[PDB]
Design a protein around this ligand. Structure first.
Ligand SMILES: [Zn+2]
Lengths: 49, 45, 245, 147, 207, 147, 530, 240, 48, 82, 41
DNA sequence: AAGTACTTGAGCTT
DNA sequence: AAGCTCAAGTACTTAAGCCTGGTCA
RNA sequence: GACCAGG
């Protein structure tokens, strides 16, 4: 009954309700409606500066 | 069984008298007599 | 904290420190710290489906030409002589002083003569830069600068001792807190990079075979040689991708 | 994404700030001196398919889970370009129509191009006697007029 | 402090109770002994002074079957090889069929094989002290056990057309077997008191 | 058009469906598209009350009820009945999955037991618990027959 | 697609949502013969783990039974004839020439039969050729108070086959023994019990067609007085959480916030103290829940008991329980996921919406809103957690019985009961003499303890047992004589079952059985004369 | 009485030397360890083990175990108590001075002593711990672990009314086979009552009375399989 | 096993508690032998 | 082994839940194989309901042998059973 | 002048047989030390 | 992962 | 010496039924 | 036969 649990630090990240019934129940957590996946990195040298 | 073999001896690593005790155990078990099998050990020499 | 750690390494403990480092091109690998009951910590890494197990003081002295006092004041820089850390670091330091060497050169040559066989590096070119190569390739990749690898590894060993020191909770890596998503295209790029590394190493082995036969055609300046070599080896990687998909 | 309260503009955060930020979920729930962030609209919490199940907050969560996992298998319109699709088994629902009850996001994502089922005048009643043990009935005239 | 003098007091209510239960007969007061009753029985200068006189016997109410029983306690820890075999000729002149022994602790294994071989038609049986000092057969989780005559065993073997290898068994390391004086081969008749429907009587053997 | 069963709503907690019924009978009457996103309607005023105001505007009962005469007897049902406008997204399990019959057919190369099909007219499996069932029933002949 | 009847369903354990069943067909005649006789559906009426009946009529039929047996229902000639006939359906089942009816319970000034009169009419028209009438008194499911303080329905009482008083419900006919259908199975034999179950089925069906029954919305809503009662009760439960938590850690309610938070931080780094905390918190919350449910749900809600079509289905036992209407109508209560309660994230704020170290019950897994009115988001997430836990447990459990039924047939493979009446293994060894005295294998031993039942009628049971043919061949006097000798308190007498096997000697019974019949004759001598 | 009841409770329960001891500082150079101990009043609050008991048993067995485990760390590094001073009067400290060669590597001393504390027990019946009192006017004591031998000696409670969670192996070893038989019948009935499902004791009694057919008790795995007369079953079931 | 069909199953209250529905396809396709005697020749005649 | 004599029979005289089944079955099969109908038929067609019509009249052949677990048997006619 | 409990004893004899045979190294008859043997999976 | 029974070596006693 | 019970440690098979689809080399 | 699906 481990990581197949819907432990709450997902609020708005990956949907709590929708995840299939049956064997894979609790594993595949479909992303929330608006949680993107940021894939284009950025420049951050100004951050150490 | 190979471990139990004695190559030069071609008898058992066990004492023959003990293997014959074992033999009597099964001989008397064949007809189904349980306490009668544990009886036969009642000898001390 | 996961039980397999200790009973894999019976001197070992469940206390471990994991880090998933990733180069700028998203070609990540994981190198973890396994702590052992004695007080030393071994610096797990994994190369070519092969486990590998090196002590942290070793790699730490190998990285920078350093003074051991810098090592300690990097580990337990605080509140001078806090008993727990100032004793565990003493024990580790003596334990590595046991059978190791002193200088960066000597340690690097130790490591190089050790690893040369499994590493697919050029059979000849060097052995010192092989040491500066292993610390380039496996220990800590996301950090480009050596000194920064050094500072971060000090951070890491301090945090691990703190973890045994009970002042830090057990992180629960199976939560969306410490979790991330591998997109499709990144895996695609990594598999393409791997198939290309295989292709290069394969034509390398092929030219090595041509040198191995006796010397059937040997002129490394002539182009006709290379078009022949390319003719021999399988030159398709796209079909490998299509089979993958 | 969320809305920042001390300013009035967008702000995005990842899976560290959640555990350490007092993210108010209702404009009226905001308590000052603590709440640093406000959610746009808690609709933004669920997923896509789960969102389009009307009154999804009146159901016992196992049932919303069943309806989610089972709406992903409706015999609905898999699109509109079917002349040029060589897929193996396709299902097309000849007469589908828009739900009379629909969460506005159901129009925003533009599902109306892709309806899934029909709208039936369902009378909750135990009259036929056949419709027990989770079954149901189907008015024959509607079944032959093109349900 | 001085509780050890209770351990051996509670060693006659595990022994004088261990009588019938075999078919014998003993005076009905040696079972209801009060605590100080024993101290009045076995006296000395102490106040420790319990040993050197703890030995009795009994004659069966079976009145036959060759023969009777004699109870004797070797209180000295580690009975050994010089207190097992010397206490056999004393059984032999007494013509007692089977006797008892207690010990705390550890009847030595070297003095555990050589003993049962000379007993022959007699048999020493069996116990040690500090383990069986509370009557076992007295509880809700144990039935009353009864032996069977060869006629009584023939009864079972006939009414069921059985073989003595088809009836359920009891091992001899069992406290109720060593308690009854069972030998390997005789059928005991047990009273399953399970409150489902009445209580019936099952049987078992030993081997 | 479709009769659902009352005894199915408790033990499932799909009261959201009754709310959907109200909403649909409200929307169809006037010509509205009832917005049913989660979390809109709070405890102060129920969604039921809002949709009921709508309905009593339209003309029908306020709890959603409606008087229905039965069909085969002609007299009214003593108690009113519930009629809503739900969205029945048809599912996909009808005939392919359902029925396979094996009178006589192809067999196994090795042991001449019928094959594992539904494409090769394969037989159904009967054993390793079906055996326990009969051999509890005390039907040794049925066991020896089927097995 | 094949078709079956509702009754068998609860046996096969199907929901008929679209699950599928193997149909077989034994070819030869030996096989189908033994099947038709040993395993005909009605002849499997008692599930053999216990005695209670596993078949029964279900949801629509049972609540419409509570609506037909109720005394408020009156039928005229036309409806009564029609309904009785729909219940019987003679020709296809057969066996009868012409149906016989009862006279009307009330006659002037209009002839109106009552419902229980119709249940009695059915019980009559299935009467065997010559078997004396049934009689029974046994408690019903729907407690009487729902009808009235000191109402008489309560317990179904019908002598000589007529429902004098007592409405039928789950218990009377369904998955509950000592009701109608079970005693009919006893007295009249099983091949009649099945026809009876079918007849009550079609009967309540035709009635539903006449009358109708729906689970309509207004059944859920609280009346304004009731709902403000609940809102006041929760206004009082504004704080219970902080009080209980500060009490468990021990600090006062006006405690310093800093010390309170520091204590809480000390609380859930360790885990056993959390089990204590949650025990105390769930204690106080279950108290609050008991309070508000107990005031609201039976009295607050809009419609009363009978006219309410959901409280009917709930309290009758068709589907659901009292907790279901509780959740639907008043509050949901604490959500306990894998035991204790909600899991905390590292920083101690159970959800990112709640401030760190929350003590209000709102973050303890307690949720105030009710399904009808609509649950809030914060609470919704916890409910999702608990529901999903339910699913991932029920899924991953069904593999736990995955090795035991390949364990308990290697060692209980044959274990047949030979004609010596002494259960043996197949090899030949004895395991249980007389099967723990058995009284039977449990599937029929049930009515022994119902010693009042037989003495109540006694005229039909004697004909069932067929005394004239049985007393002939079997021995009676000797074992009955020895029964007393075995009941002698001193020993040396076996249990009578060992001396005289219970097959032929019509005198042996276990001890407790004879003790029961004796101490019943002496304890309850009211029915037996003198 | 209730006071004597709680007295027996604190008696049969084992104290572990850790549960009494406070922080353990080890001053070094030679070699020196100091164990803090709480006041006698709180000491008898939780307890009722006497100061002289601490003195004697602590000294002897604490010494031995510390010796053994420090030898353990020494032998692992390869890959003694000359001075002992207990608080002979006040019972508030315990110092020990030991000498070790300088070549031996540094030792994790505080952890070693913390383990040794938990690794020594004063009054522990072999195989029992954790005695508790729970609410019927038939007051009974819950005990974690099993020692029928230990409960024989205790006459503060009846030697008859000893209810057991199964441990049927143990009681079969010393109470009979019918003991274990009725034990497992009671056990399974108790397991199946906690849910309101009915399992009439005919089936459970047959399951029991077969499970102990041999006269011992056989589990429902490879053990019982190897005994049947059917060479087809045993070959079908687990390891063909 | 042969002679054994399978389907998804709907409920019917009208038949009996004994009886089970059989669709026409299972009837027409599930076969079983019947010896032929003097008195059911008529039925088998109609059958063939 | 032995074939138990009529004078002493231990078995239970009740036509069990099983002997009824097998007796009626094999009898129905017999009568299906053009066998002697020992009772005037009622026009009934099924080769098994004839068997029940016969067993109700207790005019059936086929004594049954009840194997005791020893290896002996008792041979009971169907009329003799209850 | 098979059956169940037979196997219970006939397996006990097998286990005792091994416990006896494999323990001995030198010949009890010959007094020699016949060479040891090493295997592989 | 769970846990089982299996087998070999090192320390103590005659 | 060496016999012989004691200890952790090395090899080693199971994990519900069905049923239906699909892709695959 | 193996990996994703699904009741
Ligand atoms: Zn030799």
């Amino acid at each position: 009954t481990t990581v197949r649990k819907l432990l709450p630090e997902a609020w708005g990240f990956m949907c709590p309700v929708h995840t299939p019934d049956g064997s894979p129940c609790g594993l595949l957590n479909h992303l929330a409606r608006k949680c993107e996946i940021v894939t284009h990195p950025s420049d951050v040298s100004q951050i150490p500066s | 069984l190979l471990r139990s073999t004695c190559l030069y001896c071609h008898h058992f690593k066990l004492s023959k008298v003990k293997v014959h005790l074992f033999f009597c155990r099964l001989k008397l078990l064949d007809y189904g007599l349980l306490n009668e099998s544990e009886m036969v050990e009642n000898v001390s020499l | 904290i996961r039980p397999s750690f200790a009973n894999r390494g019976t001197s070992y403990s469940q206390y471990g420190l994991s880090i998933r480092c990733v180069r700028p091109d998203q070609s990540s690998l994981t190198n973890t710290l396994h702590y052992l009951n004695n007080g030393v910590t071994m610096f797990r890494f994994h190369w070519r489906k092969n486990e590998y197990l090196i002590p942290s003081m070793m790699i730490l002295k190998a990285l920078l030409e350093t003074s051991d006092k810098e090592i300690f004041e990097g580990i337990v820089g605080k509140d001078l002589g806090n008993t727990f850390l100032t004793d565990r670091v003493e024990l580790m330091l003596r334990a590595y002083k046991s059978y190791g060497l002193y200088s960066q050169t000597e340690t690097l040559q130790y490591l190089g003569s050790k690893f040369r066989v499994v590493l697919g590096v050029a059979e000849d070119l060097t052995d010192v830069e092989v040491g500066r190569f292993l610390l380039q390739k496996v220990v800590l990749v996301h950090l480009r600068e050596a000194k920064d690898k050094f500072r971060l590894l000090l951070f890491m060993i301090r945090k691990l001792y703190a973890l045994v020191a009970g002042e830090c909770c057990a992180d629960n890596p199976d939560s969306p807190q410490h979790q991330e998503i591998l997109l499709g295209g990144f895996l695609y790029g990594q598999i393409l990079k791997e198939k290309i590394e295989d292709w290069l190493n394969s034509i390398r082995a092929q030219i090595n075979l041509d040198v191995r036969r006796s010397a059937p055609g040997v002129d490394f300046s002539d182009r006709k040689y290379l078009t022949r070599v390319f003719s021999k080896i399988n030159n398709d990687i796209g079909t490998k991708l299509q089979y993958f998909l | 994404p969320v809305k920042h309260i001390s300013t009035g503009e967008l702000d995005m955060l990842g899976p560290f700030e959640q555990v350490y930020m007092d993210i108010a979920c209702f404009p009226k729930e905001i308590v000052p001196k603590v709440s640093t962030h406000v959610e746009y609209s808690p609709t933004n919490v669920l997923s896509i398919v789960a969102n389009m199940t009307p009154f999804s907050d009146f159901n016992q969560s196992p049932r919303n889970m069943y309806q989610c996992q089972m709406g992903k298998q409706t015999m609905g319109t898999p699109g509109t370009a079917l002349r040029y699709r060589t897929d193996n088994k396709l299902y097309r629902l000849q007469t589908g129509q828009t739900p009379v009850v629909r969460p506005k996001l159901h129009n925003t994502y533009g599902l109306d191009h892709y309806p899934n089922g029909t709208n039936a005048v369902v009378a909750v009643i135990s009259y036929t006697g056949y419709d027990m043990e989770d079954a149901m009935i189907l008015n024959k005239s509607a079944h032959e007029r093109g349900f | 402090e001085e509780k050890n003098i209770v351990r051996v007091f509670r060693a006659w209510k595990t022994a004088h109770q261990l009588v019938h239960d075999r078919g014998y007969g003993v005076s009905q007061a040696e079972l209801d002994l009060t605590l100080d009753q024993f101290k009045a029985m076995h006296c000395g200068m102490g106040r420790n002074l319990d040993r050197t006189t703890l030995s009795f016997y009994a004659k069966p109410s079976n009145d036959s079957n060759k023969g009777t029983i004699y109870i004797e306690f070797a209180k000295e820890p580690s009975v050994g090889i010089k207190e097992m075999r010397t206490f056999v000729h004393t059984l032999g002149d007494h013509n007692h069929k089977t006797g008892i022994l207690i010990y705390a602790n550890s009847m030595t294994p070297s003095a555990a094989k050589i003993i049962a071989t000379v007993t022959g038609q007699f048999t020493i049986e069996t116990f040690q002290e500090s383990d069986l000092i509370v009557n076992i057969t007295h509880h809700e989780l144990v039935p009353k056990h009864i032996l069977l005559s060869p006629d009584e065993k023939k009864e079972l073997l006939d009414r069921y057309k059985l073989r003595e290898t088809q009836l359920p068994r009891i091992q001899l390391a069992d406290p109720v077997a060593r308690y009854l004086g069972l030998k390997r081969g005789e059928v005991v008749k047990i009273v399953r008191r399970s409150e489902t429907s009445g209580r019936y009587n099952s049987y078992r053997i030993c081997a | 058009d479709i009769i659902i069963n009352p005894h199915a709503f408790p033990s499932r907690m799909t009261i959201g469906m009754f709310i959907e019924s109200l909403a649909g009978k409200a929307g169809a009457c006037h010509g509205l598209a009832q917005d049913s996103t989660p979390f809109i309607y709070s405890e102060q005023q129920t969604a039921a009350d809002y949709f009921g105001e709508q309905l009593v505007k339209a003309g029908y009962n306020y709890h959603g009820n409606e008087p229905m005469y039965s069909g085969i007897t002609g007299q009214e049902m003593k108690a009113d009945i519930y009629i809503g406008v739900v969205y029945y997204q048809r599912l996909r399990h009808m005939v392919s999955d359902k029925f396979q019959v094996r009178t006589t057919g192809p067999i196994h190369n090795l042991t001449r037991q019928p094959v594992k099909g539904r494409k090769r007219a394969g037989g159904i499996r009967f054993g390793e618990m079906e055996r326990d069932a009969v051999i509890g029933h005390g039907t040794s002949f049925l066991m020896q027959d089927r097995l | 697609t094949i078709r079956m009847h509702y009754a068998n369903c609860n046996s096969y354990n199907a929901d008929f949502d679209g699950d599928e069943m193997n149909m077989h067909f034994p070819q030869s005649t030996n096989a189908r013969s033994e099947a038709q006789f040993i395993a005909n559906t009605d002849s499997q009426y008692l599930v053999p783990t216990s005695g209670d009946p596993l078949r029964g009529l279900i949801q629509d039929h049972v609540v419409m039974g509570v609506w037909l047996t109720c005394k408020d229902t009156f039928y005229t000639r036309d409806e009564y004839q029609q309904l009785l006939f729909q219940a019987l359906k003679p020709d296809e089942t057969g066996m009868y020439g012409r149906i016989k009816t009862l006279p009307p319970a009330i006659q002037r000034p209009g002839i109106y039969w009552t419902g229980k009169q119709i249940i009695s009419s059915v019980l009559l028209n299935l009467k065997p050729s010559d078997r004396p009438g049934l009689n029974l008194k046994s408690k019903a499911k729907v407690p009487g108070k729902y009808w009235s303080p000191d109402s008489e329905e309560g317990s179904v009482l019908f002598d000589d086959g007529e429902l004098l008083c007592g409405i039928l419900d789950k218990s009377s006919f369904g998955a509950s023994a000592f009701g109608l259908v079970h005693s009919v199975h006893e007295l009249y034999g099983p091949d009649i019990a099945g026809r009876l179950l079918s007849v009550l089925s079609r009967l309540f069906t035709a009635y539903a067609q006449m009358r109708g029954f729906t689970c309509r919305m207004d059944d859920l809503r609280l009346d304004e007085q009731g709902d403000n009662w609940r809102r006041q009760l929760l206004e009082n439960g504004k704080s219970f959480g902080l009080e209980a938590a500060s009490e468990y850690v021990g600090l006062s309610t006006d405690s310093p916030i800093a010390l309170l938070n520091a204590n809480l931080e000390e609380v859930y780094r360790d885990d056993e103290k959390l089990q204590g905390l949650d025990a105390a918190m769930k204690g106080k919350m279950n108290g609050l829940t008991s309070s508000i449910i107990n005031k609201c749900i039976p009295d607050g809600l809009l419609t009363k008991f009978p006219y309410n079509h959901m409280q009917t289905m709930t309290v009758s036992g068709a589907k659901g329980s009292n907790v279901n209407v509780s959740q639907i109508s008043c509050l949901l209560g604490q959500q306990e996921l894998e035991g204790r309660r909600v899991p905390l994230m590292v920083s101690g704020k159970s959800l990112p919406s709640f401030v760190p170290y929350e003590t209000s019950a709102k973050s303890g897994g307690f949720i105030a809103s009710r399904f009808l009115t609509g649950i809030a988001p914060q609470e919704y997430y916890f409910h999702c957690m608990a529901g999903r836990e339910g699913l991932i447990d029920t899924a991953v459990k069904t593999s736990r019985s995955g090795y035991l039924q390949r364990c308990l047939m290697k060692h209980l493979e044959g274990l047949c009961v030979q004609y010596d009446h002494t259960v043996r293994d197949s090899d030949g060894s004895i395991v249980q003499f007389h099967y723990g005295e058995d009284s039977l294998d449990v599937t029929k031993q049930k009515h022994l303890t119902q010693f009042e039942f037989s003495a109540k009628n006694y005229k039909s049971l004697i004909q069932k047992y067929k005394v004239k043919s049985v007393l002939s061949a079997v021995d009676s006097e000797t074992a009955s004589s020895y029964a007393k000798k075995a009941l002698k308190k001193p020993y040396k007498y076996d249990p009578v079952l060992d001396k005289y096997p219970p097959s032929r000697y019509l005198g042996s019974v276990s001890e407790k059985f004879q003790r029961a019949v004796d101490e019943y004759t002496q304890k309850n001598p009211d029915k037996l004369i003198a | 009485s209730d006071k004597r009841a709680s007295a027996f409770c604190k008696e049969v329960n084992k104290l572990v030397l850790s549960e009494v001891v406070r922080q353990v500082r080890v001053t070094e150079k030679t070699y020196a360890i100091r164990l803090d101990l709480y006041s006698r009043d709180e000491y008898q609050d939780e307890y009722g083990v006497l100061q002289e008991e601490i003195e004697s048993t602590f000294s002897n067995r604490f010494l031995k175990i510390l010796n053994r485990i420090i030898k353990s760390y020494l032998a692992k590094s390869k890959q003694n108590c000359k001075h002992l001073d207990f608080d002979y009067v006040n019972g508030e400290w315990a110092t020990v001075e030991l000498v070790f060669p300088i070549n031996t590597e540094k030792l994790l001393m505080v952890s070693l002593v913390e383990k040794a504390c938990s690794e020594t027990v004063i009054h522990e019946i072999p195989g029992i711990t954790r005695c508790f009192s729970k609410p019927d006017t038939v007051p009974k004591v819950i005990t974690e672990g099993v020692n029928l031998k230990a409960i024989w000696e205790f006459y503060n409670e009846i030697s008859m009314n000893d209810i057991y969670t199964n441990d049927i192996a143990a009681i079969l070893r010393i109470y009979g086979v019918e003991a274990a038989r009725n034990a497992i019948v009671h056990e399974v009935s108790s397991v199946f009552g906690v849910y309101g499902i009915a399992v009439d004791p005919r089936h459970l009694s047959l399951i029991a009375d077969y499970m102990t057919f041999e006269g011992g008790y056989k589990a429902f795995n490879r053990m019982g399989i190897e005994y049947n007369t059917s060479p087809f079953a045993k070959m079908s079931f687990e390891t063909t | 096993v042969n002679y054994a069909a399978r389907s998804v199953i709907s409920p019917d209250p009208n038949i009996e508690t004994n009886e089970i529905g059989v669709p026409p396809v299972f009837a027409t396709k599930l076969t079983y032998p019947e010896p032929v005697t003097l008195y059911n020749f008529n039925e088998m005649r109609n059958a063939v | 082994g032995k074939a138990v004599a009529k004078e002493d029979r231990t078995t239970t005289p009740y036509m069990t839940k099983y002997e009824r089944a097998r007796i009626l079955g094999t009898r129905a099969l017999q009568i299906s194989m053009n066998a002697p109908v020992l009772v005037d038929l009622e026009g009934e067609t099924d080769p098994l309901q004839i068997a029940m019509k016969e067993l109700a009249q207790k005019k059936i052949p086929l004594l049954v042998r009840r194997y005791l677990p020893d290896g002996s048997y008792e041979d009971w006619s169907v009329a003799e059973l209850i | 002048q098979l059956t169940t409990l037979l196997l219970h004893e006939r397996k006990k004899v097998v286990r005792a047989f091994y416990h006896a045979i494999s323990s001995r190294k030198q010949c009890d008859n010959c007094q020699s030390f016949s060479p040891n043997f090493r295997k592989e999976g």
